[PDB]
Amino acid sequence: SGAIYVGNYRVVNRHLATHNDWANLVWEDSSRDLLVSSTTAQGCDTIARCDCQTGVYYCSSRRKHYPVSFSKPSLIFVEASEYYPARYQSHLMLAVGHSEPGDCGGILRCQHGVVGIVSTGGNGLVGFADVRDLLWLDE
Ligand SMILES: COc1ccccc1CN1C[C@H](C(N)=O)CCC1=O
Numbered sequence: 001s002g003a004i005y006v007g008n009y010r011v012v013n014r015h016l017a018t019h020n021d022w023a024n025l026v027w028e029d030s031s032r033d034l035l036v037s038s039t040t041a042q043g044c045d046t047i048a049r050c051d052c053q054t055g056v057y058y059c060s061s062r063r064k065h066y067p068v069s070f071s072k073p074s075l076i077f078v079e080a081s082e083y084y085p086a087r088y089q090s091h092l093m094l095a096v097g098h099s100e101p102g103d104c105g106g107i108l109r110c111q112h113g114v115v116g117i118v119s120t121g122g123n124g125l126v127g128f129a130d131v132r133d134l135l136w137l138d139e
Pocket residue numbers: 015033078081082083084089099100101102103104119120121122
């Protein structure tokens with residue numbers, strides 16, 4: 001679990017979105033595993049606007065933060081789960097690191113702010129759904 005709170009927006013993994021997220025829907029993309037909903041309280045997370053390929057992510061299955069090198073956002077093949085059939089997920093970044101399904105939502109951050117959230121894993125890899133291209137999250 002985990003979300004990003006910026007301005008009047010809440011960003012979560014689309015497969016973990018609640019009934020309230022869907023009832024206050026702003027934008028969703030199944031191919032990215034992202035959903036954005038509106039909030040009444042004002043969020044104060046900072047979104048990174050950069051091309052960093054190093055950062056730190058929170059891994060709830062280890063109660064630890066790990067420094068990682070990650071790839072640029074891209075179309076990567078993601079095996080079937082109970083939430084999606086096997087498909088290509090877009091805007092995905094991989095790193096060598098630990099990730100279990102319950103780790104989705106953990107934030108990846110660089111010196112400029114929030115880069116994205118955990119979305120995939122397995123085989124000693126961890127995938128992050130990038131949010132750096134969503135410039136409207138700041139306006
Ligand atoms: C070993 O599987 C994982 C490990 C870490 C995280 C996620 C998975 C598999 N997964 C990824 C899905 C997706 N994003 O397409 C959403 C739900 C899910 O459970």
